[PDB]
Scaffold this motif. Sequence first.
Motif, mmCIF file in Angstrom:
data_model
loop_
_atom_site.group_PDB
_atom_site.id
_atom_site.type_symbol
_atom_site.label_atom_id
_atom_site.label_comp_id
_atom_site.label_asym_id
_atom_site.label_seq_id
_atom_site.Cartn_x
_atom_site.Cartn_y
_atom_site.Cartn_z
ATOM 1 N N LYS A 9 -9.870 8.621 3.378
ATOM 2 C CA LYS A 9 -8.943 7.528 3.129
ATOM 3 C C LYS A 9 -9.626 6.213 3.484
ATOM 4 O O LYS A 9 -10.662 6.182 4.152
ATOM 5 N N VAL A 10 -9.065 5.117 2.969
ATOM 6 C CA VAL A 10 -9.582 3.792 3.293
ATOM 7 C C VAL A 10 -9.217 3.476 4.732
ATOM 8 O O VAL A 10 -8.050 3.603 5.133
ATOM 9 N N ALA A 11 -10.218 3.110 5.532
ATOM 10 C CA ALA A 11 -9.999 2.937 6.962
ATOM 11 C C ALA A 11 -9.271 1.632 7.258
ATOM 12 O O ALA A 11 -8.249 1.628 7.952
ATOM 13 N N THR A 12 -9.779 0.517 6.740
ATOM 14 C CA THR A 12 -9.278 -0.802 7.089
ATOM 15 C C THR A 12 -8.845 -1.567 5.845
ATOM 16 O O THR A 12 -9.175 -1.203 4.711
ATOM 17 N N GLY A 13 -8.099 -2.638 6.081
ATOM 18 C CA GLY A 13 -7.783 -3.604 5.054
ATOM 19 C C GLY A 13 -6.423 -3.389 4.424
ATOM 20 O O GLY A 13 -5.559 -2.674 4.936
ATOM 21 N N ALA A 14 -6.244 -4.028 3.266
ATOM 22 C CA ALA A 14 -4.964 -3.976 2.571
ATOM 23 C C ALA A 14 -4.588 -2.564 2.147
ATOM 24 O O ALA A 14 -3.410 -2.302 1.879
ATOM 25 N N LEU A 15 -5.559 -1.653 2.063
ATOM 26 C CA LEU A 15 -5.300 -0.272 1.681
ATOM 27 C C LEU A 15 -5.493 0.699 2.843
ATOM 28 O O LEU A 15 -5.598 1.909 2.621
ATOM 29 N N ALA A 16 -5.538 0.199 4.077
ATOM 30 C CA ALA A 16 -5.735 1.065 5.232
ATOM 31 C C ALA A 16 -4.763 2.237 5.191
ATOM 32 O O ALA A 16 -3.552 2.052 5.052
ATOM 33 N N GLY A 17 -5.306 3.448 5.298
ATOM 34 C CA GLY A 17 -4.512 4.656 5.279
ATOM 35 C C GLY A 17 -4.239 5.227 3.905
ATOM 36 O O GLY A 17 -3.701 6.337 3.812
ATOM 37 N N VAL A 18 -4.606 4.524 2.842
ATOM 38 C CA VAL A 18 -4.369 5.020 1.485
ATOM 39 C C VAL A 18 -5.432 6.065 1.153
ATOM 40 O O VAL A 18 -6.627 5.812 1.373
ATOM 41 N N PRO A 19 -5.053 7.235 0.640
ATOM 42 C CA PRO A 19 -6.059 8.271 0.380
ATOM 43 C C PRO A 19 -6.947 7.947 -0.815
ATOM 44 O O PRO A 19 -6.503 7.381 -1.817
ATOM 45 N N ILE A 20 -8.224 8.292 -0.682
ATOM 46 C CA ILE A 20 -9.135 8.383 -1.816
ATOM 47 C C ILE A 20 -9.071 9.820 -2.317
ATOM 48 O O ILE A 20 -9.328 10.758 -1.555
ATOM 49 N N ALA A 21 -8.730 10.000 -3.591
ATOM 50 C CA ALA A 21 -8.544 11.338 -4.133
ATOM 51 C C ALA A 21 -9.264 11.592 -5.450
ATOM 52 O O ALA A 21 -9.128 12.691 -6.003
ATOM 53 N N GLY A 22 -10.006 10.624 -5.969
ATOM 54 C CA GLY A 22 -10.692 10.790 -7.237
ATOM 55 C C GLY A 22 -12.038 10.103 -7.195
ATOM 56 O O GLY A 22 -12.210 9.066 -6.550
ATOM 57 N N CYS A 23 -13.001 10.691 -7.903
ATOM 58 C CA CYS A 23 -14.361 10.158 -7.909
ATOM 59 C C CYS A 23 -15.086 10.656 -9.147
ATOM 60 O O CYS A 23 -15.159 11.867 -9.378
ATOM 61 N N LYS B 133 0.813 -1.213 0.000
ATOM 62 C CA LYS B 133 0.000 0.000 0.000
ATOM 63 C C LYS B 133 0.848 1.265 0.000
ATOM 64 O O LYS B 133 0.440 2.286 -0.570
ATOM 65 N N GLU B 134 2.023 1.225 0.635
ATOM 66 C CA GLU B 134 2.879 2.403 0.685
ATOM 67 C C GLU B 134 3.308 2.870 -0.700
ATOM 68 O O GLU B 134 3.712 4.029 -0.851
#
Lengths: 510, 509
Positions: free
Chosen positions: B236-250, B72-73
């Motif tokens: 950002k995604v709270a939990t899981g394999a992407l925990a802490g990864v920002p959501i920046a597009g929609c 994820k980093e």
Amino acid sequence: GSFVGSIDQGTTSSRFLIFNGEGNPVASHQIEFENLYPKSGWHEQDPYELLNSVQQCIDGAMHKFASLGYSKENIRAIGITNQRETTVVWDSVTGEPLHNAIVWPDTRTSALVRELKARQSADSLLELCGLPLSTYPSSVKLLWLIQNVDAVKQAYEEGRLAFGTVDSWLIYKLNGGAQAERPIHVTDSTNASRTMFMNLRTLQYDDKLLGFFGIDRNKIKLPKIVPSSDPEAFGKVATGALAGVPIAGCLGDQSSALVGQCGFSPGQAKNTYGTGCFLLYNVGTEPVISKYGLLATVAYDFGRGRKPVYALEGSIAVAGAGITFLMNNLGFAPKPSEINALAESVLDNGGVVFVTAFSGLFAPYWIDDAKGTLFGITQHTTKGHIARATLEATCYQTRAILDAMEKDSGHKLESLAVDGGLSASDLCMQTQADISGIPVDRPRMRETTALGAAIAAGLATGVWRELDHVKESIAGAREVFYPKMDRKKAERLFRKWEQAVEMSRGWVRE
Amino acid sequence: GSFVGSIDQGTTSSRFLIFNGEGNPVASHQIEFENLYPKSGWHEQDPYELLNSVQQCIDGAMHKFASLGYSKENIRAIGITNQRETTVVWDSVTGEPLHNAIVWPDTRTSALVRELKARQSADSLLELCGLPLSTYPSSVKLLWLIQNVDAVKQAYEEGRLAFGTVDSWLIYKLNGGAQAERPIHVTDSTNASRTMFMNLRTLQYDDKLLGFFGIDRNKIKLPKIVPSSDPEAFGKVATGALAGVPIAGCLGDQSSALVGQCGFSPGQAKNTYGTGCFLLYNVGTEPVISKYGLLATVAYDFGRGRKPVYALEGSIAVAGAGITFLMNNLGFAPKPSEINALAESVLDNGGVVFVTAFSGLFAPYWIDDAKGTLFGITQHTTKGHIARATLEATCYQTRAILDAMEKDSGHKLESLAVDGGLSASDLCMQTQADISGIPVDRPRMRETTALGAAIAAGLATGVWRELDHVKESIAGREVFYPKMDRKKAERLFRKWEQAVEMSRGWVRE
């Protein structure tokens, strides 16, 4: 007992059948023969392929007739029925063909028709002979031959040229053509009504008709017009298994079919299904000139003091050809039976209407700028709906023609008989009864056309006393389909069809 | 390196892709989920089936990503793109769905639509929001839900009802729905343009629009409308394999496809092929209200001071569905490959024209009383002619829509990009170029829709600096050029329009 033979010389096949006193065959033989298509739209046959095809069916059928314990002496007489219009030219002196016979579908005359329609008096022909100018009648085929083949042009001027429809050629040759005591060169009223040379009301050659085409009666040999039923006008078979057997009947094939269905009263109709349809409508003793492009023709001329009976005729281009289109062009199924099965698999047409105007539409619509047009397709439309709509298309067009015949005739449609091809489809004939609001009679004995000629021959030689005796004697798979559909529903379906036809016109641009 | 993830939540499928800086996916995972059809014309989905499908694709794709040596980093941010209009209602406090989501094709609103069009003020809606009343927009679906499900009406009247399109639902839950520090209930400009609640020109909720539907701003919780590209608004995604990864597009999916095609200049259009077609036409920063029944919508709103970009939209009912019709209904062939081959078997359509109006025709024709109508059939007509005519039907309708877009907008058609479904047919694409007289661009990379959300998220977090950088980076068969003489193309189109006109008035009731 005593039997009656019938020569049925068709467009692609010949046949000889031997019928008993109730009109059921006891011996039969069929042969498919060679059709020639030299150029596109050209359709020819060797006249000797027609005669030999027939002679082989006589030999074959009589070989079994013998196995049954019977001989020619058990045959009271034979009748002849033939593809109409097909034109034969032969040398009066040799008795041999000067050119191949031009079959009725032949289109080489296309240009020659356009010129003749422009000529003066072209407007008068329909009222005289009952037919309009087109590529089909023998008149244009004979004139084309004389104008484009030097053997027959030469023959014409030398006075040696003989003309005949297939009936005349067969009867001429079977009597031992040219090398024979008392040569027989005749044609019956039904066949003669197809040339455009004969006045429909008098049943005799008309000089104003012959004059229009430029054919001189004194210089060509025309067949003598005789009744469709006569004990002597046709002579006898000279040699072979039928040597000495009289020919006593002669009818154009579509007329012969009407006779085979016992359609003897005004308003009785028949439809014969093949690639398309040939419908005939008995109109009685006064001919009816159509206001809807239907043909006026002779139903039968049985003589014995009785008046000749006339008919109205219409045709449909696409009947069995629609099934063929579904099977081969669209690959719905490999057999026609299975096409019907698809049509029966669904409860109704699913709203689909197939205006099968592959080559436009003819009587009573005469729409030359439509093509095949399929309406009502949605994501729920399946092969079965299209199969049903294809069968329904023939029923709608059959009704449209019968409706026109009623208007032309003044005689209400009294009955409809069906034979051949798609008439075997229980669903289609049930649909016909539903749509037309009339019972549909389908004879189980399938050789209706051949029987017509046997009836003609049998009447001339006391096999049957009268026409009422024919009916009573013949009437002694389902056979009759009765209307089972709500009238309001049949009329909605017919109006949807007529809506589709109208919406189909004007597709083609030039 | 740095990568961008994209959640692509579709009508029948979910998927998660990880794109590199050149717009190429390096890890992908797709899951088909369950669609529910209780009654005829009804279309529903379990909101957790969409979320769980998505979460399963994240886990799956990140397992492949790890095998590549990344975690994820290495993902700077993720973007989300979604089936539009599909309407979700959940409880403000619990964060749980009160009813299944009503998917965009659902038609239970037909009677309610008839009533709303009869209403007064209905004539004003088109110019305000860019869309006319129909069964599709979330407004009528939400109002139907409030009027026919008492869990929602009570939730609505009790003040607990939260509304969202699929984007809003996914972002809300992925951040941790309800029980989350800083809970996120948002929607981007493109998705919000599809409800009929938002003024198209201001990109904000309109009291005249909400009032028309009877939706109270103070009683229901509506998502905050934000740009399609933003570094913070989506959390950002709270939990899981992407925990802490920002959501920046929609982005709504069809807008995302235009972005994925780099359709950034006025007059650039895209067509996305599926069962039917969705065409979008970039018209620039000032919206164009159609005079031909096209929809006016937001193409993308990338913020950062930039002005939002608008589009004209049209759709075709029968594209891939026409091939399916030939295969199954008529039994022409068992695979789309072979239907195309039959169409290639003939040199031309054989005079056949197939007005594929199975459910009538929409923009620009608007013929509601036609059905499927096949012209030109003779004894020489074969399966190939009909297959050709079926492919041609989508091209003719594509041109009719593009022609209307040009007239509405005044912007000349600059390019046509295609993705999905029937775009794989070289013949269909080449015929489209022939009929439209313009090159047709088909990217060799297939996940055009997912890439759009990745671009949006990448722009917000400096994976790409500008749209010129996006274009150049991604640019590091493909184009079909017109090869048919214009004289013949115009004859073919005229025969189509003749057939279309000859088709009207079939249905009588």
